[PDB]
């Protein structure tokens, strides 16, 4: 969890309990993998744009726009 710790600390993230934190870690892991696969597809000409991890890493795309 070295990278997860640095991500939480850098973005000042707090969770209410272990279940909440692991739930958020799971969303973040799925988003990291999505980013990796998208960028590989972009390197092969599939997309005209690239992705990167940011402060919204532990959220669903719906959550970002719909509080």
């Amino acid at each position: 969890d070295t990278h997860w710790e640095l991500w939480k600390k850098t973005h000042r993230k707090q969770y209410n309990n272990k279940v909440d934190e692991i739930s958020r870690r799971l969303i973040w892991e799925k988003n990291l993998k999505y980013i990796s696969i998208h960028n590989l597809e972009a390197s092969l000409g599939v997309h005209t744009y690239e992705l990167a991890m940011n402060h919204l890493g532990d959220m669903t795309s719906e959550e970002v726009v719909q509080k």
Binding site: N31, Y34, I35, H38, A42, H47, T48, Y49, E50, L51, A52, M53, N54, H55, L56, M59, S61, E62, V64, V65, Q66, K67
Partner: protein
Amino acid sequence: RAPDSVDYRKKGYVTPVKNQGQCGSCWAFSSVGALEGQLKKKTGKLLNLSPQNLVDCVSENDGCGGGYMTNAFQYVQKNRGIDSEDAYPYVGQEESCMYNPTGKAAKCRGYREIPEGNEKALKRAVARVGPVSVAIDASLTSFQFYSKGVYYDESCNSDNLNHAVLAVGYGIQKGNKHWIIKNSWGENWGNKGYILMARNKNNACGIANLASFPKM
């Protein structure tokens, strides 16, 4: 021949990228951006205007629960002004209206709406008027983690408008026409807080579905 392209950041019509934080104030950032561009055009001064003024005082909107840029422009017109960010700083939660006319930094004489779905009309407005308030579908993971390039995702739904941002120009990158879009998720999102969105790709993400700009 030079290309036909516009970038109001180069002309000093755009303030730095802001971070709305947890509060659903995208509409207030989009509105002040559009007002900031017209103020620069009118008076030659570039000044941060108060999104908090709009959040606390536009009673036709819902503060941190969301609202329309058109309601914001009508409030500034009816209120005979909006405060500077300095006179009314952003706290990222809704509070009692504390508008103070001594901090007034801009006025508004109404708003104009772009005809629904017409990207050429939006282009003419950006070119001839300045930065324009726009609503998009930003609901995709591909938008959530946008970093660089021209955003074009066929899953984007032009009928699902769920975010408000600011069109500050248009151009072309690696043969892909784009809109230059200022977001309000801080400089750690996108390209220093900006996204290039596909232009003339059948109104991608509903970019020209609810575009408006203030009259000054």
